């Protein structure tokens, strides 16, 4: 919608962001091409933009960035050799050609696993050429997550750069740098899983359920706004999500900019925490708004019992506009409880809808739904207590031993799941507790909700491949709102037959003394799951003693001169003593 599309986007983004967004885009489309080849492609597109910035009437400056990036994909000589069918996409005319490329993006490309180099090597290269160090970082991540939103990844690179600038100028760099890198890698993987789950849930459960989720979250974010303003923001927010899932980078960035412009031009009627966000730049504004803290809940709100319990003309409004009346109930309840999780608010709204659906059809509706608010209390106290109990357990045991507590609990919950899946789930949940128990209780539940939603979905899609547990399949075949309580409601499997003993499962060698602290813990936790599977009726006292004996067994044999004999003699004694202690 401009005279020169490439010259305008270059001015809005600047040279810094333009180069990075083009680098991320090429790596996501052409995942198998080397790094230096993408660099030469970025500098060609970047230098062409500078011609249009100096004269918008120059050659090819009138063309949109889609067709300029499109035929630039068709300029590579190996197009058909590396990506067979893709070269035939180029015979199609835009827009029919850009959608042809989105098909070819490989979600799981055959590339080597990223091995983190030593701190000395990474920073001797970070100071050698700082811009090249960040470009390779973007190149290797973008071609392994082709659907990762590019400006989102661009913000990780800035945080990735701020760590190397700070950490590697301080003595004992690893104590500063490595925890910052592992923290990001976890948040980056969580961001990738969240972006994918937002799209998958939008298409699986329908646009109505997606809108209901946004109503609860935006009402928590913007409690001073009106239902008409919140309901409109939900429609536009869903419009942006529907467009952003299509895969187009520029279309998704433009819609995010439009919504950011509307919210910034109506601050006095939305929320008061946006004066700082609305002076940010084009890519920083939408990201800033999506992370804005909740505005102050208004003062002296009326009780929800008036418009939803203590009113004769209530069932009529439910039949007047069901989704609008329920939407008002979601809006009024969410704005007053920013400490509740969105899924929790959806349970209450679903419970309220289920009550009215049966109450109005009865003889006396008012006396039927008179105690509908009593049904909400057992649904609110359950997640409140669950978080409080586990945060006290985490504060007592620390992250590692807290994972071991979740390990035994879930392996006794469903022992049919494969061992690496239970370890991955229990470790990520321990990370969630380590991430959210730091916050006050008014922020613990919203903090844990987004992380727990993907963690249980990873378990579901992993267990979907090889179904072994009928209980896990049942809890996974539930609503996203009912999926979490389904797992927590499960008790220990009484009919689980213990698996036979395997010596190689509990046998350990001198190689365990060379891995890092993380992989070494993972090996103990893997044996902990297998120990529970073999003796599921074992008590917590009997398992804590074996785990404590395991720590001394690994600690002794790693400090010994003859580590080979130590792991063989002590392990042969440790297993025989543990097997005799349990029975």
């Amino acid at each position: 919608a401009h005279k020169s599309e490439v010259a305008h986007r270059f001015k809005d983004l600047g040279e810094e962001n333009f180069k990075a967004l083009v680098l991320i885009a090429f790596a996501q489309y052409l995942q198998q091409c080397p790094f230096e080849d993408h660099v030469k492609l970025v500098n060609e597109v970047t230098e062409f933009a500078k011609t249009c910035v100096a004269d918008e009437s120059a050659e090819n400056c009138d063309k949109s960035l889609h067709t300029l990036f499109g035929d630039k994909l068709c300029t590579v000589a190996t197009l058909r050799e590396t990506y067979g069918e893709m070269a035939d996409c180029c015979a199609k005319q835009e827009p029919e050609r850009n959608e042809c490329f989105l098909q070819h993006k490989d979600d799981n490309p055959n590339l080597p696993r990223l091995v983190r180099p030593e701190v000395d090597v990474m920073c001797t290269a970070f100071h050698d050429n700082e811009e090249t160090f960040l470009k390779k970082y973007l190149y290797e991540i973008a071609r392994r997550h082709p659907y990762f939103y590019a400006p989102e990844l661009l913000f990780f690179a800035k945080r990735y750069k701020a760590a190397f600038t700070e950490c590697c100028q301080a003595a004992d760099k690893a104590a500063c740098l490595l925890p910052k890198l592992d923290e990001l890698r976890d948040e980056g993987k969580a961001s990738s899983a969240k972006q994918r789950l937002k799209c998958a849930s939008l298409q699986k459960f329908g646009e109505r359920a997606f809108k209901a989720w946004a109503v609860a979250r935006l009402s928590q974010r913007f409690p001073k706004a009106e239902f008409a303003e919140v309901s409109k923001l939900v429609t536009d927010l869903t419009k942006v999500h529907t467009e952003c899932c299509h895969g187009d980078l520029l279309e998704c960035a433009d819609d995010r900019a439009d919504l950011a412009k509307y919210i910034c031009e109506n601050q006095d009627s939305i929320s008061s925490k946006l004066k700082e966000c609305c002076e940010k730049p084009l890519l920083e504004k939408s990201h800033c708004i999506a992370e804005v803290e909740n505005d102050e809940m208004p003062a002296d709100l009326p009780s929800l019992a008036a418009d939803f319990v203590e009113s004769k003309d209530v069932c009529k409004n439910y039949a007047e506009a069901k989704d609008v009346f329920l939407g008002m109930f979601l809006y009024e309840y969410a704005r007053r409880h920013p400490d509740y999780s969105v899924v929790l608010l959806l349970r209450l709204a679903k419970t309220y809808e289920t009550t009215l659906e049966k109450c109005c059809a009865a003889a006396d509706p008012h006396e039927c739904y008179a105690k509908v608010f009593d049904e909400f209390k057992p649904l609110v106290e359950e997640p409140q207590n669950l978080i409080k109990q586990n945060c006290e357990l985490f504060e007592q045991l620390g992250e590692y031993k807290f994972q071991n507590a979740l390990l035994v609990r879930y392996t006794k919950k469903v022992p049919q799941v494969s061992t690496p899946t239970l370890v991955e789930v229990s470790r990520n949940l321990g990370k969630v507790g380590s991430k959210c128990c730091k916050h006050p209780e008014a922020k613990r539940m919203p903090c844990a909700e987004d992380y727990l939603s993907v963690v249980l979905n990873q378990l579901c899609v992993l267990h979907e491949k090889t179904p072994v547990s009928d209980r896990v399949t049942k809890c996974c075949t539930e609503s996203l709102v009912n999926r979490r309580p389904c797992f927590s409601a499960l008790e220990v499997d009484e009919t689980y037959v213990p698996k036979e003993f395997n010596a190689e499962t509990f046998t350990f060698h001198a190689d365990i003394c060379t891995l890092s602290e993380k992989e070494r813990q993972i090996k103990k936790q893997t044996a902990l799951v297998e120990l529970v599977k073999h003796k599921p009726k074992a008590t917590k006292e009997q398992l804590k003693a074996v785990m404590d004996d395991f720590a001394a067994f690994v600690e002794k044999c790693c400090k010994a001169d003859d580590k080979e004999t130590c792991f063989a003699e002590e392990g042969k004694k440790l297993v025989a003593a543990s097997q005799a202690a349990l029975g």
Partner: nanobody, 118 residues
Framework: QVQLQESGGGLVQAGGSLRLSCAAS????????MGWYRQAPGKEREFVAT???????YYADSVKGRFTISRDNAKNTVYLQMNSLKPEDTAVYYCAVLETRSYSFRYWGQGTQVTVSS
């Protein structure tokens, strides 16, 4: 203390056999156990085989199934049987005496040389 001396090493060909002996000049108590280490050219010291209790044998992965270790408790001599020798086995072979509870070195040998040639 007690001295250790290795005997039986030399020049052998690939696929051949060789027997290494290691006699101690003193009584090896029921505590201490004896084993074998090797040091390839340009490589650090490496575990080979060890024996304790008189029947418990523990070998390294590269030599498992090819080397066999045994001890004559009354003769104060540990035996290392080598079969299906490979050129990678060319190293200086030491026999050592170690404590059981601590698994630490106590007595080192002089070291006999074994060279496997194609």
């Amino acid at each position: 203390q007690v001295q250790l001396q290795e005997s039986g090493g030399g020049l052998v060909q690939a696929g051949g056999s060789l027997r290494l002996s290691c006699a101690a000049s003193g009584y090896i108590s029921d505590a201490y156990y004896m084993g074998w280490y090797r040091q390839a050219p340009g490589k650090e010291r490496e575990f080979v085989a060890t024996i304790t209790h008189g029947t418990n044998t523990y070998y390294a992965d590269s030599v498992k199934g090819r080397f066999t270790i045994s001890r004559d408790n009354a003769k104060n001599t540990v035996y290392l049987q080598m079969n299906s020798l490979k050129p990678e086995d060319t190293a200086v072979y030491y026999c050592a005496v170690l404590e059981t509870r601590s698994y630490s070195f106590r007595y080192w040998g002089q070291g006999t040389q074994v060279t496997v040639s194609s």
